[PDB]
Write a protein that binds this ligand. Structure first.
Ligand SMILES: [Zn+2]
Lengths: 50, 50, 522, 49
DNA sequence: CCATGGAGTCATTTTATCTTGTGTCACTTACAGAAAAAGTATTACTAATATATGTTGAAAA
């Protein structure tokens, strides 16, 4: 995804570098709300809270 | 400067208001103003005072 | 990637817990590193015009509030065609437009070419033609597919009132996909059937709106629409099911586009048809078009409009052409007989009237043919399948384009089953690619067949030999009306006196430039 | 260029001149390891030192 | 030979800069107009799709 695409492809976009964000911290925490929503530009967005 | 390139080359009869071209030329007023009020820094190009 | 200095562990887990940030493999217990380093806190021929490219692009792009994203995407496409030098000799607007357009098409987002083209003087054949050409030079194939389900939302935002519209939207969709199911969806503009369903469900919404207000988003005619209204009215369970319960009937009926019904009103095994063949013939001597064209019954010479002289004849129902250099194109030929033979007839005019001009350089260029399979066809699936070899731009033009290099021909495809073919260099290519792709026809069906023989009728060289091939043999094909095909001398004088009557200003300013050739001195 | 005159141009000689950096704010002032930071609160029952 | 006067000679003033400003966190965000290359679009045609536009119009209500 980082590089310059061409319209030449076959199968695998399947390569995914994953950077799941750890919750660091000095103590336990809870998640009481999460939000799947979109801005004007029509791209998925998640803003959550602990 | 926009309507200029309209009246450069007078092929046939060009009027067609060149209005909806305000869209393409717009929103530097709008979005630029957003960027301003979010920045915290104002650039005044009339006085060159910032 | 690396591996432990000892345990030979390849799996590295980085502990961030204690805020050491130290990476170790669960196979050893030795970190391979200490304290990972981290960060802190235009003169070109091409690239200046590239700043122009984004500039004009980014400018004209989001005037439609299209995604900032997709614009960035299309820019690299402009660089792609820029590499092919597709960007050289054509109006930059048509280019920058098409560039953006391929993206949104590839991303299937709600905009329409006819919609998007409007931000200028565009006749939409301009840009559509451009986009079509960059397709000819780009192997990008199947991605730009369309349905109204996209458009209807962006339409509803212009439709005001309330949110019953949204409820109504779901109405239209089931309607829409059913109309896709009822097989009338094909061969017409997505905007038309879109606003069609939008209306029909608004009439289902018991509101008062206008075709005007509809085409306001749609940008088609009214008669356009209501031809599609009645195009629903004639259907099965049209008014019979038109009542409430949101059309619980999902059932198909038949699939019968209006196309072949026109064959009904006008009313493999079917052999394809010769339409016309493009040949050419060289005379060999450049000569005055004016003086020679002065005597003919069939002539037009107007360099103000088109340079050369127009050759046309009712017999054998042909046209051909002439050049100034002593060449000509041969046209209006359904077969090779009337082709080379009449080609020899046109030389009887000159060699009778004008200069030497033998019969030389007879060469085929294009060949045309047509056919019909007498049943409706699903074209989109073929484009969904053979779109690598196929080109379908929905309502950009109803005729579907197919691309085959073996043999090398573009194919002319239709739901009606009427199929036309040209670009062929050979009569046998007709049956080659024709019945070659017919198993694609009978292959694609919903719910005669025998090719007979691959080649039956005589070849091209046979009918070419049926004509006298010797340039010096002339009077043999003279109809004796070619004696008559020349006008008399006074017709040349007085007629020419009139044509020069207008054209002495054309030839005048011509001679005025020729006089400026004297002004070359000073 | 862009012709906006951002400001951000110097900082090689100025790199080792003032404030936080090489002059005497980073090298003479080196940032340190094996440390911690907290707030204060008494324990008289804790001995001096 | 000594005198005035001039010419160098060197103190000396008042200008017009250039540096620096206690240390610490919280997060931190080019210029316009020229000449050339060139390739493309018209500008002819047959030549067959079936939309789309229109207009009109004529007929029908
Ligand atoms: Zn290891």
């Amino acid at each position: 995804s980082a590089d310059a695409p061409n319209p030449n492809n076959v199968n695998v976009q399947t390569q995914y570098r994953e950077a799941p964000v750890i919750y660091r911290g000095p103590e336990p925490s809870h998640i009481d709300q999460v939000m799947m929503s979109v801005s004007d530009n029509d791209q998925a967005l998640i803003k959550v809270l602990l | 400067l926009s309507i200029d390139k309209v009246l450069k080359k007078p092929n046939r009869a060009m009027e067609y208001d060149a209005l909806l071209s305000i869209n393409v030329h717009s929103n530097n007023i709008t979005s630029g103003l957003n960027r301003a009020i979010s920045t915290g820094n104002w650039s005044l190009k009339r006085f060159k005072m910032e | 990637m690396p591996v432990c200095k000892n345990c030979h562990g390849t799996e590295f887990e980085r502990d961030l817990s204690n805020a050491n940030n130290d990476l170790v493999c669960k196979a050893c217990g030795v970190v391979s590193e200490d304290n990972p380093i981290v960060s802190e806190v235009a003169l070109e021929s091409r690239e200046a015009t590239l700043n122009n490219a984004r500039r004009k692009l980014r400018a004209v792009s989001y005037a439609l509030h299209i995604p900032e994203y997709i614009t960035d995407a299309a820019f690299q496409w402009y660089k792609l065609a820029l590499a092919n030098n597709f960007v050289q000799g054509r109006r930059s607007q048509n280019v920058i437009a098409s560039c953006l357009y391929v993206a949104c098409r590839k991303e299937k987002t709600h905009h329409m070419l006819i919609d998007f083209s409007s931000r200028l003087q565009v006749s939409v054949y301009s840009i559509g033609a451009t986009f079509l050409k960059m397709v000819k030079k780009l192997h990008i194939t199947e991605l730009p597919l369309a349905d109204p389900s996209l458009f209807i939302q962006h339409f509803a935002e212009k439709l005001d009132l309330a949110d019953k519209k949204i409820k109504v939207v779901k109405d239209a969709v089931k309607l829409a996909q059913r109309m896709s199911k009822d097989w009338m969806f094909e061969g017409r503009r997505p905007a038309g059937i879109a606003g069609a369903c939008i209306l029909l469900a608004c009439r289902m919404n018991n509101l008062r709106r206008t075709h005007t207000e509809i085409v306001a988003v749609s940008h088609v005619a009214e008669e356009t629409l209501q031809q599609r209204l009645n195009e629903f009215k004639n259907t099965k369970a049209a008014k019979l099911s038109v009542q409430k319960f949101r059309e619980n009937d999902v059932e198909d009926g038949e699939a019968r586009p209006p196309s072949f019904v026109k064959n009904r009103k006008k009313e493999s095994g079917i052999v394809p048809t010769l339409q016309n063949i493009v040949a050419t013939v060289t005379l060999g001597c450049r000569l005055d078009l004016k003086t020679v064209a002065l005597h003919a019954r069939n002539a037009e010479y107007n360099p103000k409009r088109f340079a050369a002289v127009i050759m046309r004849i009712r017999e054998p129902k042909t046209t051909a052409l002439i050049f100034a250099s002593g060449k000509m194109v041969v046209t209006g030929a359904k077969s090779e007989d009337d082709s080379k033979l009449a080609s020899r007839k046109y030389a009887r005019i000159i060699q009778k009237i004008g200069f030497a001009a033998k019969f030389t350089d007879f060469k085929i260029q294009n060949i045309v043919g047509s056919c019909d399979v007498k049943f409706p066809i699903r074209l989109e699936g073929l484009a969904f399948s053979h779109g690598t070899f196929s080109s379908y731009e929905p309502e950009l033009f109803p005729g579907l384009i197919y691309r085959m290099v073996k043999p090398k021909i573009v194919l002319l495809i239709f739901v009606s089953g009427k199929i036309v073919l040209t670009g062929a260099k050979q009569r046998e290519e007709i049956y080659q690619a024709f019945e070659a792709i017919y198993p694609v026809l009978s292959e694609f069906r919903k719910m005669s067949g025998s090719p007979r023989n691959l080649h039956l009728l005589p070849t091209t060289d046979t009918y070419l030999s049926k004509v006298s091939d010797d340039p010096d043999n002339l009077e043999d094909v003279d109809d004796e009306e070619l004696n008559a095909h020349l006008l008399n001398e006074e017709a040349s004088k007085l007629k020419e006196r009139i044509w020069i009557g207008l054209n002495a200003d054309f030839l005048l300013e011509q001679e005025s430039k020729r006089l400026k050739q004297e002004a070359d001195i000073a | 260029n862009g012709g906006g005159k951002v400001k951000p141009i110097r900082g090689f000689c100025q790199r080792l001149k003032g404030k936080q950096g090489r002059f005497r704010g980073n090298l003479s002032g080196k940032r340190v390891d094996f440390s911690g930071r907290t707030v204060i609160s008494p324990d008289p029952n804790l001995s001096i030192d």
